[model samples]
Target: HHWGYGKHNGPEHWHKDFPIAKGERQSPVDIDTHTAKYDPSLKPLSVSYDQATSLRILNNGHAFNVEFDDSQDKAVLKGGPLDGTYRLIQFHFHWGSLDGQGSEHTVDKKKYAAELHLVHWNTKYGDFGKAVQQPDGMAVLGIFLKVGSAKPGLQKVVDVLDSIKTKGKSADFTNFDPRGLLPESLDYWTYPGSMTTPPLLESVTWIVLKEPISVSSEQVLKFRKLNFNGEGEPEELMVDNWRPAQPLKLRQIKASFK
Candidate 1:
């Protein structure tokens, strides 16, 4: 069977298939604010998105991804810890069954209800596949979601859940700009880490934003309706689709702001 967030194939068992799951610089490490060094040299993150770039939203079995048009540089993430422009490829979310715990990267050991990852790849590598193997090839911007008032920005994605209720399901999603989902502050903690999921390549430059965007409890519950299984398979609600924090051995967590 393929890997999933189940008792048999969850995170603990990932190393059996992808040895890099146990490799150094693995992601989703706990962000201990007291220990994070404030680096004044880190530039502010630069994000530019074309509203037309969003093409579709699909259930990739593990999570729902809103894929963008990366054939050009219209949507890109630059500055911050990155050396060159990184094209935005896709964005996904990880949430829990409940509201208290879900996010992959935690702040001061605190877990939010959900988390968003905007995935980008270095343009210098010429291709995302080749970039995934380089240490500084990928940059993932992470934003935490806490329960509060309804977020119109997030409601756009949530409204499309019914169309993509089952694994492998997808719907045409266009004219959506991910910029609306961002929190007011771009302040974040930077670190060298891997993708939080399988393949688990130790190539990601994680930029976890400091502030969290708000979403209502009802809004988050809608995501639970998504199936981890395919249409004909036994229905399994996709929840807790997050990897637990990994060890932060010999890694430094840098804060872009004091």
Candidate 2:
């Protein structure tokens, strides 16, 4: 059975059922700005997006996500932390809980209100699953979320929440650009890590942005309202669906910006 987020099935308990939950090169490591080495030689990122590639939105119980059309080379990520073309698969979010922050990675030990992950898979590997098995399998762009003014990019995403609030639920969603959701600066930290979710494949090349996108407190509430349970079951808040920072082990976290 696919595991979920619960007191009994949450992150801490994942290793009980799947041993790789504690695998090496896991994601959401604490980014120490002071220790990160600046690499001026790092190539600039190339993002080519086709608006038509936005397929729809889905609520997978763990989090609500906007899945992209990955059938062609329309939406791709090249250069910058990525060695080859990676197709956009989907994008999702993690929100702070009623009591504390929900962001996966913290910078200088400071956690933001939330985080956004734009997941992509290497094209050379043919498919997302096969890519996850290789060293150059995947690349995920991590954006920190701060509470401030209402953002149009974010508003677009929040507006569709009501249509897909339960598990296995999906709705027609388009007119959205996952690229616009990014902050002004693309400067980032890069490292070899794994998916923040199940299987915890250690092949992802994580690129964590330095600047954060702003959202209002009310916008935060909308995400918290997403349900973790579906029909015929008691509903639970989807807030705090974040994995704690894993140890960096012997890995080096690099900065593309000074």
Candidate 3:
């Protein structure tokens, strides 16, 4: 089931309405990056996205979701920050009505136009749902977005935006490689944090890339045209769907392998 927030749609009240949501992790917050005390070695192992596995694309009105077959698209981690192989489960995007700001993770309280979350889990610990429960069981690769005259590499994904322009509509996408969506630079910032979503479990090992991908004004506008309602329905204009930044509290975020 899909859920979100509004004036009367705050996250606090969502759990009561949707019991299943209790197990989900919500995002969008500020976790301090300067004070991290523990720095784990992050090692990159051989990872490949296979084409045999079918890819599922869902138009959830808010964003375009791509679910990869766990059997394929598997990634392994050998050293640094992580100690085992983690499989890539699914990947999705977060956007706003405009190009100025839409992402959940902010830098020094600065907001970007949008953000993309590439979620992966340690296969040694089991699937994502279970792995996300452990402190080092999950890793989320974050890519920031900025407004520019030229369209970002996301156009590859946005190209299918029209197919699922309406909510609850989806299509099959084959021959699509998610690796192409990653930023050019591998440098990143890491931290121990919870999912931006609810239950706010403190189980995520966040790896936010230092670089940001660029998208055009028109491309940013395409996300705003999505509707929360089912497909073929009138468009529901969504300009801002991001949660406010959260406090870092005593958490420390570190930039590793720089």
Candidate 4:
């Protein structure tokens, strides 16, 4: 009865209720590098994350979100196509049940095994909920994930999967700096788009990293073990949780690097 990635309530059926589902500037757009305009003026990304601000990890019915302490400016993102600072609220991932087939956004129509998003809200908005409904109120840094060699950083998360394997479950995930998960190259593509999930508000200014991080094939498959089903209910593997590319319509994708 509720919304889900199931056939009746899945992406293709989203527009039946949430009208913005079919909007012109929807998220998870395919990035065609050749078509993207190079912007020399794009500033370098600036991130200041307090190691202690790394709070908890929760299986929030969709993804294992790594939440942060946002009471103050513990984790802030600025520069790089943004006018002001956006505090990091949480970080999450999207994956599939299979290899080489996850992720929301693609490159030149090519899909990756998974994708990562660090959600942030504009400081000027006062609060995250308020920011979600306004233009330029959000900035999400997207990182592509490919399959190869185990990553120690991600393994730290996987190590605790069994404890918080069910929905509504969470555990302390402190002292872990998210910067360790980022790629060497900070080059990226920026655009104006809506959230990739429900409500799908057109508030996010997407900054997608051009380079991808690598994870082992075994590690990539571990994500499939997570489910959307609650305890006592039939387990539903939360794979292919990504939405397909939407129409570009009238927007332009700008690159921070030549």
| Best by the TM-score measure | 1
Model 3 CA deviation exceeding 4 Å by range = 11-27, 31-54, 72-79, 149-152, 232-234
**Superposition error at 46 for model 2 (Å):** 1.7
Q: Candidate 4, 222: how far from true, in Å?
A: 1.5
**TM-score to true structure, per model:** 0.98, 0.95, 0.81, 0.96
lDDT of 2 at 8: 78
> Which lDDT tens digits does candidate 2 get at residues 3-44?
776777888887877687777888879998999999877899
After superposing candidate 1, which stretches have Cα over 4 Å from the reference? none
Model 1 poorest 10 in a row by lDDT: 43-52
Better of 1 and 2 by TM-score: 1
Give the per-residue lDDT digits (tens) of candidate 4, residues 66-162.
8888878878889999999899999999888777678899999999999999999999999999999889999999999999888778888778777
- Best by lDDT, which number? 1
Q: Write the per-residue lDDT of candidate 3 for residues 176-207, one digit (tens) a residue.
A: 67666666676666666666655566677777
User: Residue 85 lDDT in model 3?
Assistant: 64
Show where candidate 4 strays beyond 4 Å. 50-52
**Model 1 misses residue 217 by how many Å?**
1.2
**What does candidate 3 score on TM?**
0.81
**Which segments of model 2 are wrong by more than 4 Å?**
50-52
Better of 2 and 4 by lDDT: 4
Question: TM-score ranking from best to worst?
Answer: 1, 4, 2, 3
Worst 10 residues of 2 by lDDT: 46-55
